[PDB]
Amino acid sequence: SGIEGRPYGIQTLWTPPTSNPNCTVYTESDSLLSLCLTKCGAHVLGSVSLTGVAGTMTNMAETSLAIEFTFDDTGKLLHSPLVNNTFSYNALAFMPNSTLYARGGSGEPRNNYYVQTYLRGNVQRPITLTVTFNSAATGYSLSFKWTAVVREKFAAPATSFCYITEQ
Amino acid sequence: IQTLWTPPTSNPNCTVYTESDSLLSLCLTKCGAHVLGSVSLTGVAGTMTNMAETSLAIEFTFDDTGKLLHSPLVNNTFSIRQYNALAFMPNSTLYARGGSGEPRNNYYVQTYLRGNVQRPITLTVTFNSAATGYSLSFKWTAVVREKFAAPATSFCYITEQ
Amino acid sequence: GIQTLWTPPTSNPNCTVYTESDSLLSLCLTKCGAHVLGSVSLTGVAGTMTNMAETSLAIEFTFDDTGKLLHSPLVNNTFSIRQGDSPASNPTYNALAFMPNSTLYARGGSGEPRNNYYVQTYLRGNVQRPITLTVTFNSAATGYSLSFKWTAVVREKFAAPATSFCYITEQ
Ligand SMILES: CO[C@]1(C(=O)O)C[C@H](O)[C@@H](NC(C)=O)[C@H]([C@H](O)[C@H](O)CO)O1
Ligand SMILES: CO[C@]1(C(=O)O)C[C@H](O)[C@@H](NC(C)=O)[C@H]([C@H](O)[C@H](O)CO)O1
Ligand SMILES: N[C@@H](CCC(=O)O)C(=O)O
């Protein structure tokens, strides 16, 4: 399964650790994504990183890259960039709170969490990760947008973020 | 009890300059000896939408039992989500009282004013600046004659108990 | 009940970077599901830590393949479970539940971007002196490790403010 849930009853939702690409940004299996969401009271503590492995991911054409995990209003996964687009518990306990992070609110500052990091861990390549909560007009979502450098390989190091949950 | 928060809301709940001029989110969740905290602050009325100063500070102060004494919230809404208060207070050995100036009492966050990439700002979260009891202080950079809004951010500190 | 590995909060130097007890380190790791939430800060107290000779400073905690601590910069290696989190004498715990995942953060992988977590902060909290903390997972070729490297300013005191980071665990 692409996203899997693990007990403390479910306390972790993650992409299982892998040594191989598990994600499709531009072409199939072109990248290795880690995404892990763990519940701590009203918070989800999230970690994310994304390593380019093949194709355009190793020779970027654009100055940013975005992916999104979208869920319906019950918290069921609808879509993700994962090669294994599947899921295998109260899902709303992991969804971003829709009162605080209003649906369709990507333009609202409080729906966005900004992280400074460095492309490929190179300090001469500062980039910014924007994590957005509930950009989707219905249901729930988590969006990740990183800046990038054209004609260079993409890799975003380990990062983390936190949001308040729906339940 | 794992969470202390101001409950999620979409209407103003906070008073920085005038009553109910802003929407504050502050949530503290306990994970062992840590509190994981999140905060954001959105201006909605008055000077918060047309700033007069280039920084904005708010503070939550608590007594030596962990009871809230003062905050900028319009109503007494900082509460247990629907208990030992000291398990949520910043550790007073590591973060000495009256320690606003001590580096280890301060936690820095980089963000962007109104999420605008031309407006990088710093948030300084300070533990136990108060001379007695406990405190959490937040100070953000701002730009005069512009609206203030600080995006979602987070921080982490070690607890007293 | 055991959720925390730490060096205890103290007001006295507890750490040796260049000379014995020259610094005050805080390091605390708390488990939340498949994550560790970590906090760290480092304050120079004496000697070269108050008058730096180099432009970066690094310390490392190494562990064996069971998660047992092998080396650290702490005087007497005072890094263990938080007292009072269990009523049992000599409480047991799964140390691998605190170790950085070795599939995601491969051993000897310090050159791999996903093994590194970058934090911006300010030297001595002076906002004119931005510095970068690099936390590296499993740099060591064997066992597990957490490495911390801060940039520094020569001929000045070193102190890094409160910071935090997060990684996925082995178990
Ligand atoms: C003397 O100038 C400074 C410094 O060292 O650069 C300015 C800096 O903003 C300040 N840090 C904070 C968090 O206030 C620091 C501490 O007060 C001092 O290091 C404590 O000993 O003093
Ligand atoms: C070629 O130089 C660089 C790069 O890519 O810019 C420098 C950068 O500091 C380094 N990152 C780290 C964490 O060391 C990176 C990786 O080692 C390499 O990309 C992995 O394949 O190599
Ligand atoms: N120096 C502080 C107290 C000790 C500290 O902050 O470390 C004060 O003058 O209140």
TrEMBL record, chain B:
Keyword presence, Transmembrane helix: no
Domain of life: Viruses
Keywords, alphabetical: Capsid protein, Host nucleus, Host-virus interaction, Late protein, Viral attachment to host adhesion receptor, Viral attachment to host cell, Virion, Virus entry into host cell
Main location: host cell
Compartments in which it is found: Host nucleus; Virion
Family under the similarity heading: Belongs to the adenoviridae fiber family.
Protein name: Fiber-1
Highest classification ranks of the organism: Viruses, Varidnaviria, Bamfordvirae, Preplasmiviricota, Polisuviricotina
